Symmetry: C2
Subunit: 234 residues, 2 copies
């Protein structure tokens, strides 16, 4: 019996292909949902889709779980989430010599790279920024480097992953601003299978309690920069 | 229409009576669930009940939500939880001149104060401590100070609250040990109460986003000492 998971595998360190993009799907969220599946005695099956098509596949029952989804009011009304399993902080990233962008408000009438069909893309359009649509976070940062855009709103997790992979490029960017709060991130499912949701939850707590959560987290993130969520009790 | 909430009102800063016992119910978790009920146009009705009977009362349908409950896999199997709204850290507290307790393992054959029917009382019993059952955290700590017990396992929130009330007392206690992670705390409901749980989650999100959570949190806690949990994103 299968746990069907939708992802886009061009998003290190969440979901990506080993061997410089040529081998097996791996990443924090990939390893976690695999462990979840393993402990539920389910066969995991992955299905890879461009981010703008991820929620559609969930809606039409092509798969049953999406990974690394930020909880928002509208999504909570329409879908079921797991307990949060990580938190990210939205950053405003610019070239290191940029001077006229000091706040999210400053993005009005500036050129900003975002991913089509994402909430940060929606935010940028609402600020009356000028969008250039990228296919993932690596490309948003490349568009920023190359001067196609003057900023990108990007969560900390993929930004710091880029600095870890490309340290000599780090000096070309700076954080101009950050959201005042971090954001809970969870697995997202269609409403109406409370049973699967409660099962994933119980298993996520088990994974915290036995040290496996910390193992997987420290494989992919630096604990001094990226926030974890609380553990559980027994 | 009512939201029935079970609580024991002798647990500052969570749930306690104003004017040293004579006034209305107040505290962090009380104000929070009042705010949630208010946004749902529900009248709250509180059912004061000793901790040993809180979960019993929920099972008995005497009320519909319990506040300040630690998530455990054994509870996640049997009950619905809201998204977490705070975290605590379990501390092993002894008198500052206690000599032979340096780890939870050292509690075997020690006398320890714990609250009847709690998970931490169960853990003390598993360690083969000798149990002195206490009626609440204040009594746990008073048992310790008066040398009627030699330890108590207590979460940081009520332990700091005791010190805030007694600011020359710092040096009467020491923290001998602490759990390795903090512990997610949520509202707990009967299993299958999925529409109430979803409503509470939506309202908790809304509270995090409009600054209400921060207002309530800061009324009761020192943000440098007590952990909050991640925010929801707009």
């Amino acid at each position: 019996s299968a746990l069907r998971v939708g992802t886009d595998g061009i998003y290190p360190p969440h979901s990506f292909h080993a061997q410089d993009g040529r081998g097996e799907l791996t990443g924090f969220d990939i390893d976690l949902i695999k462990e979840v599946a393993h402990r539920l005695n389910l066969k995991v099956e992955f299905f890879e889709t461009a981010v703008s098509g991820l929620i559609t596949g969930l809606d039409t029952n092509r798969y049953d779980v999406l990974v690394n989804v930020a909880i928002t009011p509208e999504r909570q009304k329409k879908y079921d989430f797991s307990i949060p399993y990580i938190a990210h902080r939205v950053l405003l990233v610019v070239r290191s010599d940029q001077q006229d962008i000091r706040s999210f408000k400053d993005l009005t009438d500036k050129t900003v790279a975002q991913i089509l069909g994402t909430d940060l893309s929606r935010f940028a359009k609402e600020l009356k920024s000028h969008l250039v649509f990228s296919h993932n976070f690596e490309q948003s940062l490349q568009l920023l480097l190359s001067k196609r855009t003057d900023a990108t709103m990007i969560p900390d997790i993929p930004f710091f992953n880029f600095l870890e992979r490309r340290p000599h490029d780090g000096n070309l960017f700076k954080i101009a601003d950050r959201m005042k709060d971090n954001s809970a991130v969870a697995f997202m499912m269609r409403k109406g299978n409370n049973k699967l949701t409660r099962s994933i939850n119980e298993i996520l707590c088990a994974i915290h309690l036995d040290g496996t959560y910390k193992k997987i987290f420290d494989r992919y993130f630096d604990k001094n920069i990226i926030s974890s969520v609380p553990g559980c009790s027994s």
